[PDB]
């Protein structure tokens, strides 16, 4: 349950950057999913009409 990374200060900093980027991507993709879900609900209503 851990990445195969050799323990080092450079590795630690790289993994902190990776964690920050992963959190940012998580938030951005959740917001994109919410926007696309609103658009999809609108598209479903328009499709029924």
């Amino acid at each position: 349950n851990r990445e195969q990374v050799f323990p080092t200060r450079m590795t630690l900093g790289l993994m902190k950057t990776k964690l920050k980027g992963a959190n940012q991507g998580y938030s951005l993709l959740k917001r994109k999913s919410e926007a696309l879900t609103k658009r999809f609900r609108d598209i479903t209503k328009r499709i029924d009409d």
């Binding site: 851990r2 200060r9 993994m15 902190k16 992963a22 994109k32 696309l36 658009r39």
Partner: protein, 51 residues
């Protein structure tokens, strides 16, 4: 358009769930393990200096 949006939304939701559940525990555990390993190296250096 509705079908394409459904496919894109499914792919995006799968990507968010994967990112969170896999990566964030994985990267957090990697950070914890790296911190523990460097703490062990610092402790060994401290013991050598104490000797």
């Amino acid at each position: 358009a509705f079908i394409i949006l459904d496919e894109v939304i499914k792919v995006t939701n799968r990507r968010v769930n994967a990112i969170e559940h896999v990566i964030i525990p994985r990267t957090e555990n990697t950070i914890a393990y790296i911190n523990s390993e460097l703490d062990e190296l610092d402790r060994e250096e401290f013991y050598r200096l104490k000797k």
